[PDB]
Every structure is written in C-alpha cells, then in structure tokens.
C-alpha cells in the first residue's frame, strides 16, 4: 500500500490538497421557496457535489488500492454522511444557519418549507454547534471525513482498510499533540470526535428515508446518479 508509508503531516497535507471545492447553487429559482423549488435546488447541488466527492475519494490515500467493487461499496454506504459532514463543516461560522452554498444560506424556518425536513435540519444545526463548541480544526475535519469513507461500509463485507483507519487515528493524535493538548486531553478529544460519527450516521439514515419519501412523492425528479446511490440503501 501507498497510504501506510507517508507521515502524519504528509497525510494531512494530502487530505487538505484533495478537498473538493465549494459549489454554488443555481441562481435561477432565487425567489422565496416552495417545497418543490427548494428540493430542486438541493437535489441539483447534491448531484454536482457527488461528482466532486467521487474524485475526492480517489485522492484519499489508500482508497485507490482497493478494488473497484470495494470503492463502490464504501461510497454507496457513506455518500450522504460525507455530504452532510461537509455541509456541517462549511456552516460552522454561520450559527443557526446551514450554508448549502455561498448563495444558499438557510435557517430552520426555511427548512420547514419541505415536509419532514426540519427534523434533519435541527440535527444538522446541532452537529454544527458541536463542531463550534469543540472548535473543530480543518485538519481534523478532513480526517473525520476520510474515516467516514473507509469505515461506514467496512462491516458489510478488509484488513488493509483498518490499517489505513489506524493511520488516520495516528494522524488525528499527531494533530492534537501539535496543538499542545496533554495525553489525557488527546484521547478524550479523539473519543469526542469519533462519537459524532455515530450521530452523523443517524442523520444519514434519517436523511436516506426522507429522500426516499420525496422520491415516491415525486416532489422533484432525481438524477440517475442520485437514484443509484439511493437504491443502494434498499
């Protein structure tokens, strides 16, 4: 493998270099929002973000080493978790609001414009306040996101994935040691960060069923890529 060789600083820089860009929402339905127009904006945005995520995953150290079927399984299981932790991250210095795009910043009242949306909205805002309360660093964020990619689908199959997961643990501890945290503070913050992944998984499952409802309600037509990713959870 090629990911086990490089160091922690090299691991962080490789992850920061692979970060996908921030995409803009479509300025076309920039009027006040109905249920269909808002769901159309987020479906279009998430579809374009998916394309960059798939190319971001190929730049995750150790991800190319896996077979194609294994890459497909991990991305199928984690794609909404990865989209969500990215949305939570870029919404950090916007408390009470979710920055879907620079030109699409919403609060929980606007989330009520879609049926069943405000519940997922509040869980997302709660995750953002937790990152802010913890003062989550960008180097930590890219580590958690790579952990989600490699971990979320690993117990639905392997030994190489856990070795790369251990490498990101070593990388996480290395970052906290640089920040001056003591040993006790290092494995407490490690635990606090990883426990959030349990809640991000919960949001993904609740988001997955919510996107399945509006597929059947057919409020907005979904792209073929989104349909294939949604069908993998059924």
């Amino acid at each position: 493998s090629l990911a086990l060789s490089l160091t922690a600083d090299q691991m962080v820089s490789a992850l920061l270099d692979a970060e996908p860009p921030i995409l803009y929402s479509e300025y076309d339905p920039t009027r006040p929002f109905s249920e269909a127009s808002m769901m159309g904006l987020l479906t279009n945005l998430a579809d374009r973000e998916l394309v960059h995520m798939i190319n971001w995953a190929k730049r995750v150290p150790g991800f190319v080493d896996l077979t194609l079927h294994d890459q497909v399984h991990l991305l199928e299981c984690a794609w909404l978790e990865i989209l969500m932790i990215g949305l939570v991250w870029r919404s950090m210095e916007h408390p009470g609001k979710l920055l879907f795009a620079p030109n699409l910043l919403l609060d929980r009242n606007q989330g009520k414009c879609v049926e069943g949306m405000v519940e997922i909205f509040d869980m997302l805002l709660a995750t953002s306040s937790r990152f802010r309360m913890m003062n989550l660093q960008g180097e930590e964020f890219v580590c958690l996101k790579s952990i989600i990619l490699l971990n979320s689908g690993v117990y639905t199959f392997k030994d190489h994935i856990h070795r790369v997961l251990d490498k990101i643990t070593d990388t996480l501890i290395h970052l906290m040691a640089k920040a001056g945290l003591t040993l006790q503070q290092q494995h407490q913050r490690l635990a606090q960060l990883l426990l959030i992944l349990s809640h991000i998984r919960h949001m993904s499952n609740k988001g997955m069923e919510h996107l399945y409802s509006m597929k059947c309600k057919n409020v907005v037509p979904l792209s073929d890529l989104l349909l294939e990713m949604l069908d993998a959870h059924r």
Binding site: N55, Q71, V72
Partner: peptide, 10 residues
C-alpha cells in the same frame, strides 16, 4: 451501480 463505475475510472 453503473454510473458510479464510470466516474471512478476517468
């Protein structure tokens, strides 16, 4: 799972 196959190979 076929569209994901194409994007992963470019």
């Amino acid at each position: 799972h076929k569209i994901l196959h194409r994007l992963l190979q470019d």
